[PDB]
Structure 1
């Protein structure tokens, strides 16, 4: 069925399934539509015989240069997407709700790439985008497929961040604190203003764009301080670096960062350490530092993230595309 976003009880029941699912993702929460408020939300779900939700897909619809919309369920759907006969059912409900308005329904779940799952999806009529489309550009994937995820369940007795690491990395993490870096965290307007200063400074220093502060305000209004937390590293009253992390489902995700110019006294390591400590303190299974371009020393995202994640990056299946208007799909989507 399709969710009526005007029925608060229905909305809460859907939120309850999403927040309690092992496959929950913050970008499938309904709060994510509030953040991406320039997209149109359409949300669907299936129930079991007892009428409980068993699977759900939050979509956002965006414009294209054609008469069709792009329908995107970011990191969904929420279920075991390897159960492809259940996924087909869920997707059929989604396609019904889109009602011919979109040219594709794309979803990019966090499930491991494998040849057999790739092949299964293709045999079920989906178009997949992964190893066949690797690169950076108008045609690469929306979410990075290679991600640095620390599995904290490998360290069931860890009490603090440093318990997870070899002595050479304990020294890396200890350094900013020894040098007077101190981290505070919260989700008020004051931490957001700190973040936004460091975020726009970094963006100016790299000659890149940044999202407007209203996006993060929307985020702060959609998520409370047990879901969304901004960590602000300073030294002797001087602002150095910040990061935003979202706790949802089985993971805390380091989603945004900023840093001042010049000497930052390894403050980013202090921010990671504290994010990690929040994952330990809440008994959260995974800490996700997000994407890399290649598992290579030449990749600076990889270099920094690999301090914290010594295991293999996770490689996900990529983009799964339920093609709805093939003519428009071919115009807009190339390898």
Structure 2
């Protein structure tokens, strides 16, 4: 069925499935459509024989240089996507709801790449984008396919962040705190302003592009402090580093961050230690530090995140494209 966003009871039923599913993703929450307020939401789901929701897909529709929309279910759908017969049924419902308006429906679930799964998706008619476009780098796909994920279930008795690490890394994590760095957290306008100052400073330092503050205001309006939390590191009243973490489903996700210019006393490691502590204190399975370009010491993202993730990065299946208008698809998408 298609979700009527004007029906609060249907919306709450959809949200309860989303929030309680082990496959849940913050970017599949209906709150994500409020963040992406320049996109058009279309949401579908499937029910079992008892009428309970068993699978859902939150889509956002964007404009293109053509007469067709781009339909995108970020880190969706919420179900076991390796159950491809069920996936086909959910995608068919999504395709009906799109009503010919989109050239593609793309979804990029956090499921491991494998040859067998890639082959099955292609057998079912999907076009997949993963190792065949890897040469284009991290931004070959919309979300990074290679991600640095800390599996806290490997440490069932850990009480604090330090319990997860070898002694050499314990020392790296202790160092900001020994040098006076203190971290507070919250989801108020105060912490948002602190984050935004460090975020814009980081972006200008790297010469990269950055989102306006209203993007994060919409995030803060959509998600309460048990879901979205901003961690702020200071040393003696001086703002040093921040990060935004989102808790949803089986993971806490380090999503946005920044540091001031100058001496920051390893404050970013203190921010990581406290987000990891939040994951431990809430019995969350996974702590996701997010994307890297490659598993290489040449990659500054890998070097930083490897301090906290000694396991190999997770490599996901990438983008799964249900091609709807193949002429426009070939115009707008190259297969590597």
The answer, yes or no, to whether TM exceeds 0.5 is yes
Structure-1 residue corresponding to 2:116:
116
Shift in Å, 1:43 = 0.1
Shift of 1:137: 6.6
Q: Write out per-residue CA displacement over residues 240-267 of structure 1, whole angstroms, 9 at most, x where no aligned residue.
A: 0000000000000000001001110000
Root-mean-square deviation (CA, aligned residues, Å) is: 0.9
Aligned counterpart, 1:243: 243
Cα pair 1:293 1:301 within 8 Å, conserved: yes
SS in 2 for 1:70: strand
Answer whether contact 1:233 1:267 (CA < 8 A) is retained. Answer: yes
- Residue of structure 2 equivalent to 1:65: 65
C-alpha deviation, 1:135, in angstroms: 3.3
- Mapping of 1:154-233 within 5 angstroms? 154-233=154-233
Q: State whether residues 138 and 144 of structure 2, in contact with CA within 8 Å, keep that contact through their aligned partners in structure 1.
A: no
Mapped partners of 1:202, 1:74: distance in 2? 25
Q: Is the partner of 1:269 in helix, strand or coil?
A: helix
Q: TM-score, normalised by structure 2?
A: 0.99
Quick check: 2:138–2:293 contact (8 Å CA) kept in 1? no
Equivalent residues of 1:242, 1:258 under 8 A apart:
yes
* Distance apart, 1:209 and its partner CA: 1.8
User: Any stretches of 5+ residues in structure 2 without a counterpart?
Assistant: none
**1:311 counterpart SS class:** coil
Report how many residues are paired: 335
Helix, strand or coil: the match of 1:252?
strand
Q: Secondary structure at the match of 2:192?
A: helix
Residues 46 and 90 of structure 1 are in contact (CA less than 8 Å); yes or no, is this contact kept in structure 2?
yes
Q: 1:139 and 1:162, CA in 2 relative to 1: closer, same or farther beyond 3 A?
A: closer
How far has the Cα of 1:314 moved from its partner?
A: 0.4
Are the aligned partners of 2:243 and 2:255 in contact in 1 as well (CA < 8 Å)? yes
Contact persistence 1:61–1:72 (CA under 8 A): yes
C-alpha distance in 2, partners of 1:104/1:209? 26
Displacement over 2 Å in runs of 4+: 135-139
Give the Å deviation of 1:138. 10
For the residues of structure 1 that align with 2:222 and 2:139, how far apart are their CA atoms? 31
Q: Using the alignment, how far apart are the partners of 1:324 and 1:139 within structure 2?
A: 23
Gaps of 5+ in 1: none
Contact 2:25 2:249 in 1 (8 A): yes
CA distance in 2, matches of 1:324, 1:207: 37
Kept after mapping to 1: 8 A contact 2:56/2:79: yes
Structure 1, residues 123-170: CA drift from partner, whole Å, max 9, x if none?
000000000011347971001111000000000000000000000000
For 2:250 and 2:139, locate their aligned partners in 1 and report how far apart those are by CA, in whole Å. Answer: 30
Distance 2:184 2:136 in 1: 35
TM-score, with structure 1 as normaliser: 0.99
Deviation at 1:110, TM superposition (A): 0.3
Report if the CA contact (8 A) 1:139-1:333 is conserved: no
- Worse overlay, 196-205 or 117-126: 196-205
CA distance in 2 between counterparts of 1:242 and 1:136 reads 30
